[PDB]
Curated annotation (Swiss-Prot), chains A, B:
One of its GO terms (biological process) is regulation of innate immune response. It comes from Homo sapiens (Human). The keyword Chloroplast does not apply. Residues 1-182 form a propeptide. One of its GO terms (molecular function) is ubiquitin protein ligase binding. This is Caspase-8. Heterotetramer that consists of two anti-parallel arranged heterodimers, each one formed by a 18 kDa (p18) and a 10 kDa (p10) subunit. Component of the death-induced signaling complex (DISC) composed of cell surface receptor FAS/CD95 or TNFRSF1A, adapter protein FADD and the CASP8 protease; recruitment of CASP8 to the complex is required for processing of CASP8 into the p18 and p10 subunits. Component of the AIM2 PANoptosome complex, a multiprotein complex that drives inflammatory cell death (PANoptosis). Interacts with CFLAR and PEA15. Interacts with TNFAIP8L2. Interacts with CASP8AP2. (Microbial infection) Interacts with human cytomegalovirus/HHV-5 protein vICA/UL36; this interaction inhibits CASP8 activation. Generation of the p10 and p18 subunits requires association with the death-inducing signaling complex (DISC), whereas additional processing is likely due to the autocatalytic activity of the activated protease. GZMB and CASP10 can be involved in these processing events. It is linked to Caspase-8 deficiency: Disorder resembling autoimmune lymphoproliferative syndrome (ALPS). It is characterized by lymphadenopathy, splenomegaly, and defective CD95-induced apoptosis of peripheral blood lymphocytes (PBLs). It leads to defects in activation of T-lymphocytes, B-lymphocytes, and natural killer cells leading to immunodeficiency characterized by recurrent sinopulmonary and herpes simplex virus infections and poor responses to immunization. Changing residue 72 to A: Abolishes binding to FLASH. Induces NF-kappa-B activation. Disulfide bonds: none annotated. It is found in: Cytoplasm; Nucleus; Cell projection, Lamellipodium. Residues 1-79, 99-176 form the DED domain. The keyword Nucleus applies.
Length: 182, 182
């Protein structure tokens, strides 16, 4: 019944819900230990292993389902209303997920497609410290690469590794030049 | 007359042609010395300073105009046909621009808009070694950041520097979390 119910809940959860749930459970289950988990039921049972989910303890489950906005599953399988979960989670100490994970997840919620792509681009820029706006051309990029000492008369490795994933003609130009350096 | 002709040629060249010409002249004029050059005439006179451009020496000029495919200016102002320039530049030793700069410039020629954006992205990936692609979501990115030890409970600098350039609501979530940890 109970485990059967858990399977029932697990059946209605897709890949996105699985990823979100695994992220929200990082406070108890390490990220490397999550890769064997391929569905929601494995996660549920892993939670049972840490005694955070049993017939007498459905709190963390309800919290998880509430965070990912699966209120339908709460009503259907757990008989739980949104008002109850809110009233509970506002009460201090009753929250079992850290404010950090919650914060990151809410950020992930607020972000759209374009905002996500922009997030990747901006992150890459903040890591490499080489902001490549659409103002500069390929020549300026070459200059920046020579400045970074990653491009030169005898250093074409990165240029080739980039051009190979774009167009064979470019790589053919590079090789033509490189073989004329006999 | 001669200087008049040089001004005439310089007048017909736009910003793109200027950038290309300055790039093709890096073998004689350092990059840091090219920033004062705001038009083609300054570049021409700078070439005159290095005695690479005079009434009896229009070789490097014709070569430059040929490389950037301004054959119209060659015909109009220099009385030079494409066949002549090809036949001349094919003859060894007569070329004054290194094969390296020529190679890079031809690469810049063959690349279109989308190929350029792809070049920026791929370069960023090859530099930061953090290939993300459009396959993974924001949560996987967060995991990668924690793996990179650039994101944590007490390390929100980069997350904030990214989110600030995306949406104030995200930054408001971050600050809300950060101020509730009193």
């Amino acid at each position: 019944d109970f485990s059967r119910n858990l399977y029932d809940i697990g059946e209605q959860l897709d890949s996105e819900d699985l990823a979100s749930l695994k992220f929200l459970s990082l406070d108890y289950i390490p990220q490397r230990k999550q890769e064997p988990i391929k569905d929601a039921l494995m996660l549920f049972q892993r939670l049972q292993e840490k005694r955070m989910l049993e017939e007498s303890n459905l709190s963390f489950l309800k919290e998880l389902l509430f965070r990912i906005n699966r209120l339908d599953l709460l009503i259907t399988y757990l008989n739980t209303r949104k008002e109850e979960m809110e009233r509970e989670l506002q009460t201090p100490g009753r929250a079992q997920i850290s404010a950090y994970r919650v914060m990151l997840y809410q950020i992930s919620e607020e972000v759209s497609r374009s905002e996500l792509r922009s997030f990747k681009a901006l992150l890459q820029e903040e890591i490499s410290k080489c902001k490549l706006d659409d103002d500069m051309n390929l020549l300026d990029i070459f200059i920046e690469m020579e400045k970074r000492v990653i491009l030169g008369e005898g250093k074409l490795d990165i240029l080739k590794r980039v051009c190979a994933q774009i167009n064979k003609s470019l790589l053919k130009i590079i090789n033509d030049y490189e073989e004329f350096s006999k």
